[PDB]
Write a protein that binds this DNA or RNA. Sequence first.
RNA 1: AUGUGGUUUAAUUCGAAGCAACGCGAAGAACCUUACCAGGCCUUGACAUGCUAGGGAACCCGGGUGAAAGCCUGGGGUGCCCCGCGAGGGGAGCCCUAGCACAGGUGCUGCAUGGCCGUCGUCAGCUCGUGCCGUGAGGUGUUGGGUUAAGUCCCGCAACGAGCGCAACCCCCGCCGUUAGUUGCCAGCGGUUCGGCCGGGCACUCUAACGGGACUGCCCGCGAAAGCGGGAGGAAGGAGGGGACGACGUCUGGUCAGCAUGGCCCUUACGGCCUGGGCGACACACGUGCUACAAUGCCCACUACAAAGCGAUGCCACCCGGCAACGGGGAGCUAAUCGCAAAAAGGUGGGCCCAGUUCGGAUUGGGGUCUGCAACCCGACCCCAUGAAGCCGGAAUCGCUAGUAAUCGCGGAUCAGC
Lengths: 98, 78, 60, 24, 206
Amino acid sequence: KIRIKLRGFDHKTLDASAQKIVEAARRSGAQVSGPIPLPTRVRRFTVIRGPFKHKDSREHFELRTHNRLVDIINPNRKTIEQLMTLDLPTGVEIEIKT
Amino acid sequence: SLKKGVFVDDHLLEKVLELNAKGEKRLIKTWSRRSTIVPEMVGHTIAVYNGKQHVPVYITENMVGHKLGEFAPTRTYR
Amino acid sequence: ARKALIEKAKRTPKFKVRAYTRCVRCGRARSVYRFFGLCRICLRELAHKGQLPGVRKASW
Amino acid sequence: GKGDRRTRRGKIWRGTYGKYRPRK
Amino acid sequence: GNKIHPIGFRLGITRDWESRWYAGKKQYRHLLLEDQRIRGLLEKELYSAGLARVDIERAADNVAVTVHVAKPGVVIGRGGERIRVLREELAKLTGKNVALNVQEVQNPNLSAPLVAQRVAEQIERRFAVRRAIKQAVQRVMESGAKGAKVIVSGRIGGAEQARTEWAAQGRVPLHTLRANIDYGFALARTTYGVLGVKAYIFLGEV
RNA sequence: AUGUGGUUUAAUUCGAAGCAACGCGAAGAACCUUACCAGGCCUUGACAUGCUAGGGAACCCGGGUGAAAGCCUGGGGUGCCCCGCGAGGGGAGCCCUAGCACAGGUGCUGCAUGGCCGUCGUCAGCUCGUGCCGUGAGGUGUUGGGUUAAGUCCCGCAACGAGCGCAACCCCCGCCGUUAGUUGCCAGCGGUUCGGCCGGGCACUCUAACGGGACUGCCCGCGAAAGCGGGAGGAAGGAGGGGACGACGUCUGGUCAGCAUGGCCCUUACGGCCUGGGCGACACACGUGCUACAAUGCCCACUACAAAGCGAUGCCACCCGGCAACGGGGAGCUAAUCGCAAAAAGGUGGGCCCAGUUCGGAUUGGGGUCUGCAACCCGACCCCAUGAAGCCGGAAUCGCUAGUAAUCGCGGAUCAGC
Ligand SMILES: NC[C@@H]1O[C@H](O[C@H]2[C@@H](O)[C@H](O[C@@H]3[C@@H](O)[C@H](N)C[C@H](N)[C@H]3O[C@H]3O[C@H](CO)[C@@H](O)[C@H](O)[C@H]3N)O[C@@H]2CO)[C@H](N)[C@@H](O)[C@@H]1O
Ligand SMILES: [Mg+2]
Ligand SMILES: [Mg+2]
Ligand SMILES: [Mg+2]
Ligand SMILES: [Mg+2]
Ligand SMILES: [Mg+2]
Ligand SMILES: [Mg+2]
Ligand SMILES: [Mg+2]
Ligand SMILES: [Mg+2]
Ligand SMILES: [Mg+2]
Ligand SMILES: [Mg+2]
Ligand SMILES: [Mg+2]
Ligand SMILES: [Mg+2]
Ligand SMILES: [Mg+2]
Ligand SMILES: [Mg+2]
Ligand SMILES: [Mg+2]
Ligand SMILES: [Mg+2]
């Protein structure tokens, strides 16, 4: 019944941050459809390296928004405690849906 | 090319309309070459700026759909 | 001119189409990535330093 | 072909749509 | 004119960012401009302390700003008189609640941007441009490094023709990703124009 | 079409100059941009910090004039320090004018510079320590024999080692495993208005994190060795394929117009603001490109090949009006969920019948649509008409060794639009 989207630039601070949200609902409540990894939005920017004319020759930058997903089916209040404000957000995004 | 207005500068009209209520002046000069020549506001002589000076363009009937700057040519020997 | 102009481009103007971008550092009109407000130059610079988060050398 | 507005291909190349290339 | 920035070459590995805050595609723009005029102000009124990194994090209207320095004493003031003034100065531009840790760089001769600054400082006080380099490297090797290298640009000693002095010791393998090479750059605005100081310190590995 | 040379201009702003300038700075010149010109204007200035001084001190609403900028104006206005006074004067904010320190300059110098870049060259190199040799500069090492993509490794050797390079450490793509179920499925079985749509299921596919896998490890031949030829197993051999990555140095290379910066120059102007024009000129010359010159083709209709990215001052399904561009309405989607989205080439049918053509789509007349204050100089699109050169290109000359070239469409950045 409860749906949480997880964005972020860093793939270790999702597979960490939101794989600890799997323990803080399994231990203190009921069923979880595990963490599901979403299509990542790669942004790429492409820049003429030098300040002045050197139009061939460039540098290539991406900015990669990783997305992950978790679903919890049984809303206990034994769960919404860690999943409420036992805070360890770091450089991560939090979407909460139903 | 538009169809909901002819996007003509009020500062010109206003000055032309409130000349048509008695007005037969030649020292009418403008910088709005971007304005359509409006339904029969003819007879008058508007001087249009080419970016260097105003040129007297005598406005007759055959040339009404057009813009003003079409008669103030901006570049020399073409 | 590039002072009286970094200033002018911030003023809200008669007509929104007279409006435009500018590298909020390196104060500059052309190649200005709107996702950053950053001139390609003053940008490759930050991108290198680590001052643009999650931005990284692309290689594929 | 590709240079002709009144073909379908002229449209495609130009990215446009019209009589000569309708949206289904 | 060759050669990539050694930090930027490493960001994914053996070097992480000076700004660890996510944003959507319409906040990022402003959370950056702020992010920057921050360092613009900090670095300017905090040279004395000698700041290496100006780390930053976010989580919606609060900001980390974990400034690393050689001389913590100078940012604080005897008790807490300056660190107050700074938290106060910050929120006047940053319309948010500015937190603010402070860190000691335990050994400043292994912080490349400090070593740069050091050498740059000497140059502005017309010092022996070539020995500065020589010494600086030594100092850095002396505090236990795996290698180092320092570079100064041109107009060395106010000479008419620009030149370029360098010196180095041990390893500085700029092509190895798994190296950990703190890099740093200092200016040096002198009576006869700018010189440029670059500094490389090898330490790391697996 | 575009960039450049030249010429022309009031101006056609500046730079870039063989390779390594010329679809380059420009990842978006109608006004903005804009640095150029012509005219109307402002001068302590569009922006920063302070000083000397009468005037008002927060502020609000018009009018005249003009193209706009600006300028000449008439009103609404009395909040706060201070009580020192029970009659309110003292430059506390703040705002004005008059001076002053200053701002401002995309003015010049890349041969005063930083930085960043280009370049020889991803070429196999350039060095150092100590020892040894030489009066010395220097040499040896780094020569020699083998080998490699490689100063890669091997064997030798008055050298023994090392550093910057090479390779490796990193990303993408090939095979498999683990972890995970609003995207996958009759794979299994069930219901299906037969659209994975419905309960249901992660098997598979995929998505994205972490592992595995390759080592000349194994077999035959050559070799002193490195390594070389061949074989098996394996998705993949001997660097599996593509990136990222650029030694000491060279070019007084490039940029003072991104920025930073030493010096010199302008300060009712070399600063500023505006409207208008110019950067779009056209007797010419060159570079890079597009579309062609057709039947292995062109046109029209039907027909799932699938594959990276963008989208809430947005992507717009679906209905309707218009030949259409587009205009009305209007659902879904902060997006693996909804949209841009048709992929095109291909396939199936039908037409054309070798013609300057149903090839080609320049030029030009006319009617429109959209963005935008505004589309004459200067936008893209649609529709009618008009159909130019062009029948595969002189001397010269360019790219590419495999999922390459050739060909076909698709997306993005900048961006109102282009
Ligand atoms: N990081 C720098 C960038 O590298 C670019 O890539 C350049 C090179 O790395 C690249 O490689 C060269 C090629 O230049 C040259 N004309 C012929 C040569 N065979 C190529 O080498 C080739 O083989 C090597 C090793 O096998 C590869 O690693 C290399 O990247 C590949 N291109 O081709 C480009 C130039 O011809 C550009 N040099 C330069 O514009 C840009 O700065
Ligand atoms: Mg090119
Ligand atoms: Mg002529
Ligand atoms: Mg614009
Ligand atoms: Mg045709
Ligand atoms: Mg110049
Ligand atoms: Mg130079
Ligand atoms: Mg230079
Ligand atoms: Mg030059
Ligand atoms: Mg001797
Ligand atoms: Mg080697
Ligand atoms: Mg060899
Ligand atoms: Mg390498
Ligand atoms: Mg020169
Ligand atoms: Mg102008
Ligand atoms: Mg041009
Ligand atoms: Mg023929």
